[PDB]
Design a binder for this molecule. Structure first.
Ligand SMILES: Cc1cccc(NC(=O)[C@@H]2CCCN2)n1
Length: 460
């Protein structure tokens, strides 16, 4: 039975509004409703992995798992296995996988982050799951961010706290946050970003939605504008939105948006918004294709509609050679040539690099670089041809060209990372000097760049 080189992943996000679900929720898992929807001809084909994020979820874990499994079994005639379930307050993540994937799944991790301080601490935050699928690391974050149209900056802060503090994936990747630990990272939830238009324009917005004319609304969506200004979700992707705003509906119909201020809302307006979102970030040159992104039309127990997204995701096999794992394969080498980091920092410490990758027995520390001043103010750290030659565990090009090198640039004085990035080994040529590049981030914000040349030797 061959190992797969691609799987499909379902991501769902639903703010259930503290109400139990209706008896049938299959439309969600079938990607049917509004937006980019799934072909009817695929309805019986199971996804490999289903990841369900809920917010304002009133059910017990047991109650929701029974509904989910019975839903999938009705669609696919497959009894899915539970990979993980984790709940913080009313924020929950469930990961289910086809039983044939049991032997392929390992290193299952869960964690949560509570985002608020005092007043603000006690119901917002995030849950997450990670695991390995054969040679591929997968991370999943369900976040419920701060509500209210005038709190976009709090939402951005909530995002940075979650990616700093959520402890998923390989703890040996100590310089790296979740935005660098996974081949594929999916971040979804009730992100709570709103369409920023005047209150007086509510009925105009409703009209636009009834005409399915979303362009002048999406141009005011706070998540799209904050992303375009590099204030949040730097280096993540989102499919184009082609479904109506998923909040705030009157319950038991989808015919009415309930936007007007009420005591129950804290006297805040809830103009129709795309609160409920799915974003992803995959390592460079790994296959990831969104095959659906939309909302259901027939699940009406909440003031939100469920959102679905599905993905093709490239995966790699576990590799065993005569040599690695458990020795190097001297037929393999990675040389980083004429590299330099450009940093935005005002500090004047010396810096060194660390190279981390599951193609190495353990991470590699470089010598200190040579600091120079850039023409426009910047620190430039030069490494020359001084960098340690990296010795991968397997030299077979079918393995090595699918790997990635994580890079951290660290202060000699503090051993703190000033920037993290990732380089693909999916090169146009081996035994050939080729340009490489990554942006460098720290706490998910841009802090610099790393560029230079690579020379990769494989057994071919
Ligand atoms: C589908 C599923 C759910 C939960 C766990 C797993 N698989 C594993 O944990 C494998 C079994 C042997 C060691 N690792 N698969």
């Amino acid at each position: 039975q061959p190992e797969p080189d691609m799987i499909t992943i379902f991501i769902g996000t639903w703010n259930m509004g503290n109400a139990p679900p209706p008896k049938k929720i299959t439309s969600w898992f079938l990607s049917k409703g509004q937006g980019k929807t799934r072909d009817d001809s695929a309805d019986y084909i199971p996804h490999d992995i289903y990841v369900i994020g809920t917010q304002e979820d009133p059910l017990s874990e047991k109650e929701w798992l029974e509904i989910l499994k019975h839903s999938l079994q009705e669609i696919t005639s497959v009894t899915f296995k539970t990979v993980a379930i984790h709940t913080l307050w009313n924020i929950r993540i469930v990961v289910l996988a086809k039983p044939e994937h049991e032997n392929r799944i390992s290193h299952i991790c869960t964690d949560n982050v509570k985002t608020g301080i005092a007043n603000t601490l006690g119901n917002k935050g995030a849950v997450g799951v990670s695991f390995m699928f054969n040679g591929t690391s997968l991370g999943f974050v369900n976040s419920h961010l701060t509500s209210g149209s005038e709190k976009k900056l709090r939402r951005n802060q909530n995002y940075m706290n979650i990616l700093r503090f959520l402890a998923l994936g390989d703890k040996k990747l100590s310089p790296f946050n979740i935005t660098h630990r996974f081949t594929h990272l999916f971040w979804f939830g009730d992100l709570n970003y709103r369409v920023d238009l005047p209150t007086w324009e509510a009925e105009t917005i409703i009209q636009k939605i009834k005409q399915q004319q979303y362009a002048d609304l999406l141009s005011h969506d706070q998540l799209l504008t904050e992303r375009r200004e590099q204030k949040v979700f730097l280096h993540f992707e989102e499919e184009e939105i082609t479904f109506a705003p998923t909040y705030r509906f009157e319950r038991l119909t989808r015919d009415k948006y309930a936007y007007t201020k009420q005591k129950a809302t804290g006297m805040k307006y809830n103009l129709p918004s795309w609160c409920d979102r799915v974003l992803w970030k995959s390592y460079p040159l790994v296959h990831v294709v969104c095959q659906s992104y939309g909302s259901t039309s027939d699940i009406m127990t909440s003031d939100h509609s469920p959102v679905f997204a599905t993905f093709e995701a490239g995966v790699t096999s576990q590799f065993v050679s005569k040599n690695g794992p458990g020795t190097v394969d001297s037929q393999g080498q990675i040389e980083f040539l004429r590299c330099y980091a450009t940093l935005k920092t005002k500090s004047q410490t010396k810096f060194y690099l660390e190279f981390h990758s599951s193609c190495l027995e353990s991470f590699v520390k470089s010598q200190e670089g040579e600091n120079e001043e850039g023409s426009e103010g910047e620190l430039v750290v030069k490494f020359g041809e001084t960098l340690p030659k990296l010795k991968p565990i397997i030299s077979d090009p079918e393995y090595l060209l699918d790997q990635h090198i994580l890079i951290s640039i660290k202060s000699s004085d503090s051993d703190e990372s000033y920037g993290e990035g990732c380089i693909a080994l999916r090169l146009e040529a081996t035994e050939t000097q080729l340009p490489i590049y990554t942006p460098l981030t720290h706490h998910g914000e841009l802090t610099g760049h790393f560029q230079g040349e690579i020379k990769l030797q494989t057994s071919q």
